[PDB]
Design a protein around this ligand. Sequence first.
Ligand code: WHA
Length: 209
Amino acid sequence: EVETFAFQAEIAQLMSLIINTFYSNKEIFLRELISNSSDALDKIRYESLTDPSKLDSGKELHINLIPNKQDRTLTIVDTGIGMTKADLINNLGTIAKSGTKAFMEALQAGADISMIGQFGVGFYSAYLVAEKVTVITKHNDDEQYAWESSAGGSFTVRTDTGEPMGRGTKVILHLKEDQTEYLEERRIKEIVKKHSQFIGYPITLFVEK
Ligand SMILES: NC(=O)CCCSc1nc(N)nc(-c2c(Cl)cc3c4c(cccc24)COC3)n1
């Protein structure tokens, strides 16, 4: 069963701005997804202090970067808190706690797209480089779910079976044809060193077979 939803109007507008604005400094998408993964790891770390059983789904707190040249995908995986089905729809489909409104106003008043992470919507910078984004997530309180969107104002949610994660979130970027530099080991290393060198969890860059 696949459920299809419309993004809240302002999120669709935000996504269109990211896709259509001429803006060359696209590499910042990676810092933004790593920062979200770091935040999700801080959350599970904190919850586990009072309830150690929340780590029964995995004690390791880390971030993995997985390029795949054959599939033309870059995946950012974390063992963070993850999202229930309700969290997934709310967080990715609506303004929720984000600064979506402030960001679009800021862009009209001198801000630039690299400042997206100051507004709680850094995830959407994935659309600078990806034609489609799939988000696989597993929270201790729910089953595993797959969210997906190629923009256009809609997204889908379905249960995800056959490749269960212990806990966390996997953001799969189906790269645009002209954005394959983000699959190169040297490029990813350069971006991590430039923008994510102080993250408080191990970031492992996988090698291709
Ligand atoms: N940090 C927390 O309090 C837990 C948030 C849920 S777990 C999580 N993990 C990662 N890697 N990413 C997200 C995540 C995604 Cl995928 C996408 C969006 C998010 C937004 C805010 C916070 C987290 C996210 C708003 O913009 C959309 N959420």
